Write a protein that binds this ligand. Structure first.
Ligand SMILES: c1ccc(CCNc2nc3ccccc3[nH]2)cc1
Ligand SMILES: [Zn+2]
Ligand SMILES: [Zn+2]
Ligand SMILES: [Zn+2]
Length: 454
């Protein structure tokens, strides 16, 4: 069982208000047929338009919530809503658009999906809370067939053009009018009691229902992210490299060794309490300090309460490297992912949180500035006790107050420490822009690092 069988049953109870008289016994095969699609027994990599929950999770970057609300359905205008905030009105003749015919509506859909998805995924997955009109309206902007490649590259085809009779990926679909071979999943098939608004509002207060299709589309994908990444966490699932994943991770590791090594040299703590990831290693293996580990997995719902992390039976320093707590103690070094960051790695989440996808998927709770009241923002600095010796990438004399080296203390930064400073500043910028934020105990002062050059 790799894919979802077309002969699997589809519960049609959620469809019988828009589609009265719908058979209670229904398969995906009859549903697809009812929707106006002829699969014609094709063994060509597209076995079903609908997918399993496991396949949807593997493709979370492709998720677009989709809802259709019949404003007045053959004779009536439909309101098409997407989890991008877009509301299009199709006439059968926050971004709310006026009534236009399907031939122009379909052009806008291809443009919107391509601009939203070209840097996230090789496909689209329409996340539904299916009542009927979204499924029946699919024939107006979707064409299906065998799996294909783009006419301008080796990526899989996600669009089709009736104007040129050609196929394209999200990057080369400019002017294409049809969504080709999309995927979809109905959240209403997961066994929920009650309507979408009531199930969604149990876990989220950020999304409301201003009574437009996009509001329901946003609530749909949000409820789907909750079930698959907040209440359920599968950390075995690997995700493709779509950006600066490798650089961002290596940058985070360089920043961590730097920041922790310097705090231990500056304030000479006898013990460091490392709270977080159970698979953690000492980031400064040669430090004098008594290193003590505490296991706490990445919380994906609410930020850990310091009362429960600690008090259950102030000396030294606490290291909270990506361990999201409600209020950090004053003696801490903290790396905290900012869920508000706009990037191709950070997808929107549930209750203000976000889905950060870099190798694994991590739903992170909403960033809260009040978690850091006992700390201050960590300033940039580069520290090095390594010998001044080149080994060699051209040079322009470096002058900086934040290059804490013997050469800068002695009056002139050497070429080696200037290359190492410029590389460290790039890794630092990479990490800050990726969404991470650095915080430290208020007594941290880089002025104390100069006296380690005796
Ligand atoms: C079950 C059993 C015991 C515990 C507390 C362990 N002792 C501890 N954790 C610390 C963190 C930071 C600083 C000092 C600490 N001492 C928690 C859960
Ligand atoms: Zn292409
Ligand atoms: Zn929500
Ligand atoms: Zn030097």
């Amino acid at each position: 069982p790799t894919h979802l069988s077309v002969d699997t049953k589809f519960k049609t109870e959620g469809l019988c208000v828009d589609i009265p008289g719908i058979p209670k016994d229904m398969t995906y095969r009859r549903l697809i047929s009812m929707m106006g699609f002829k699969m014609n027994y094709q063994v060509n990599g597209y076995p079903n338009m609908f997918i399993t929950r496991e396949e949807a999770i593997r493709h979370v970057r492709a998720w677009i919530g989709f809802d259709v609300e019949g404003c007045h359905g053959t004779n009536l205008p439909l309101q098409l809503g997407f989890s991008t905030g877009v509301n299009l009105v199709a006439v059968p003749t926050p971004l709310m658009y006026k009534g236009l015919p399907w031939n122009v509506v379909r052009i806008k859909i291809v443009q919107m999906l391509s601009d939203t998805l070209k840097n996230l995924s090789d496909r689209v997955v329409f996340v539904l809370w299916a009542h009927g009109f979204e499924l029946t309206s699919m024939k107006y902007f979707v064409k299906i067939g065998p799996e294909r490649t783009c006419c301008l590259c080796d990526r899989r085809a996600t669009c089709f053009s009736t104007a040129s009779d050609t196929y394209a990926c999200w990057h080369h679909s400019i002017g294409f009018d049809y969504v080709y071979n999309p995927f979809m999943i109905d959240v209403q098939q997961w066994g929920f009691t009650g309507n979408l608004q009531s199930n969604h509002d149990l876990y989220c207060q950020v999304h409301g229902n201003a009574h437009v299709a996009s509001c329901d589309a946003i609530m749909t994908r949000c409820l789907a992210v909750h079930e698959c990444f907040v209440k359920r966490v599968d950390w075995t699932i690997e995700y493709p490299i779509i950006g600066d994943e490798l650089k961002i991770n290596a940058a985070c590791r360089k920043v961590q060794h730097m920041v922790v090594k310097a705090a231990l040299l500056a304030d000479k703590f006898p013990v460091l309490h490392d709270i977080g990831n159970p698979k953690a290693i000492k980031c400064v293996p040669q430090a004098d300090v008594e290193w003590k580990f505490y296991d706490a997995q990445p919380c994906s719902d609410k930020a850990y309460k310091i009362e429960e992390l600690f008090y259950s039976y102030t000396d030294g320093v606490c290291l909270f490297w990506n361990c999201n707590v409600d209020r950090y103690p004053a003696n801490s070094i903290v790396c905290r992912f900012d869920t508000r960051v706009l990037s191709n790695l950070n997808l929107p989440g549930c209750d203000g949180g976000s889905l950060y996808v870099n190798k694994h998927a991590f739903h992170t709770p909403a960033f809260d500035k009040s978690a850091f009241v006992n700390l201050k923002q960590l300033p940039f600095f580069y520290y090095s006790d390594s010998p001044c010796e080149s080994h060699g990438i051209d040079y322009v004399p470096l002058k900086s107050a934040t290059c804490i080296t013997r050469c800068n203390l002695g009056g002139a930064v050497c070429r080696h420490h200037a290359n190492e400073y410029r590389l460290y500043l790039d890794a630092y910028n990479m990490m800050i822009s990726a969404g991470f934020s650095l915080w430290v105990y208020k007594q941290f002062d880089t002025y104390n690092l100069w006296n380690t050059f005796t």
